[PDB]
Amino acid sequence: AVTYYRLEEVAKRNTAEETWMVIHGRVYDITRFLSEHPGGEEVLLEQAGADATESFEDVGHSPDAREMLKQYYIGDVHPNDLKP
């Protein structure tokens, strides 16, 4: 039973205390990654709660970073929130 979030709840996690992001319709808690993030600490906080999809793809991220993504996954965006 995969879990769901809602953009709204996602959005509440705009801090360093707790960092969430949405990439390709999956939510993540990046909280712990920041320090590891080769491209920056500030870039991500710059988009907490946000759907950085467009952003992360516009910076080109590798398959390796993609794979890294799997460890910070917390769920997917609510279907009803999915934008089709």
Ligand code: HEM
């Ligand atoms: C969990 C989310 C993210 C993960 C796991 C991740 C991972 C990585 C990794 C592994 C690299 C180094 C080389 C590569 O694999 O391409 C990298 C570089 C970088 N990423 Fe991220 N990234 C994430 C989110 C973002 C976002 C949202 C942005 C922009 C808003 C961003 C901007 C950058 C920049 C600027 C660099 C390095 C400088 C450059 O290559 O231009 N990253 N990231």
